[PDB]
Amino acid sequence: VKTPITEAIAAADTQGRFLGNTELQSARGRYERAAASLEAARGLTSNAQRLIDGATQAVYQKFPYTTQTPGPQFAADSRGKSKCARDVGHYLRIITYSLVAGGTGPLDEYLIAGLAEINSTFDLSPSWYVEALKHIKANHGLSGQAANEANTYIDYAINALS
């Protein structure tokens, strides 16, 4: 699965050669680069419960019909709202997973793989989840270069949504 340490391996393995300095340069970046990525993981893990209920009530604001229309897909009764905090709470897990991995791999393999297939069948509009993730990237309270770090992977999930 996609990781800068893995991407050095799978490039050098398909050539059948050893690890050159060009694969070994790349390993260095995660080490230097990561130090600021693990700063972004603790910023989201500690503020996790504020961010989920901060998000699942922000999507109810912009889409008030989602709590009113009686549908299995729609979050009309409590069972949808129970599956609301499950789904949005699944997003902050995988975002924090792809932070400490350094790559988009866990985001690519757990979340966005086959997302167009599932949202068409269950009629879940992807405009809902992109509205929650814009709330997360503006309200995580992160600062510095770590604020850039979570902001890529959130926005990477946004582009895969649309």
Binding site: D13, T14, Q15, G16
Partner: protein, 284 residues
Amino acid sequence: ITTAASRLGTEPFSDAPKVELRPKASREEVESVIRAVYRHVLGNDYILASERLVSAESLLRDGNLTVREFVRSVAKSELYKKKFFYNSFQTRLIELNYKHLLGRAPYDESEVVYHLDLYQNKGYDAEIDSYIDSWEYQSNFGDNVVPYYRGFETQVGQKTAGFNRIFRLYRGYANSDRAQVEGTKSRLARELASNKASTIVGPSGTNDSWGFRASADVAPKKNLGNAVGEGDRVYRLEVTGIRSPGYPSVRRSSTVFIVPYERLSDKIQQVHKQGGKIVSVTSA
């Protein structure tokens, strides 16, 4: 594999020259190109006159169509679909298409996952294209190179679990792919997802012992117990076909017996008394 080539039957494929259509064709080489495509892509099934694909051989003589775009025309035909596609399971198709066109065994699980997603949204028409329009095909086969058996060789980093599986795909020179002794079911679907690689049984006939494929509930490959031997010196044994009173005394043949070093002298005499033949003897 100089020494093991005879046992493998890989002696024909070892020093076999690639067929290699020239930029200017001649009739003696073109029919020799079509024969070696027909053997490898169709797994040596006999082709009669109605099966000869007389129109697609017609295109080849002109030189307009290269070898690689000829192989897609024989794979997309109903002829190749009548033999393989309509009976076989869909995982059985994937190990065939890797064997027919790329010439090797499916080594990783991700290749079976990825190829089923392609067949579903786009079709088996577009699935044959994914083998041919791939980098593993273009690197080892040019546009004018007839595909061959690349499985026996090291193949630039191919997993050595893949090397065992190629002998489980085909059983020798005289076999075809509709004619193996397991028929319609898939052969490398269990070993691929379990990530265990069973015994390289040699092909038949020159080997006295051939009837051992990986059973459903086999005892584990590496033991952990002492196995009642004063010291840890345990060798795994695989027998093919045990003849005895077959209902009460030997209810299941082709099973492993896990005997340590001290009684291995005794154990091989016990197996041979029933008449079963040993396949493999693996330490543990």
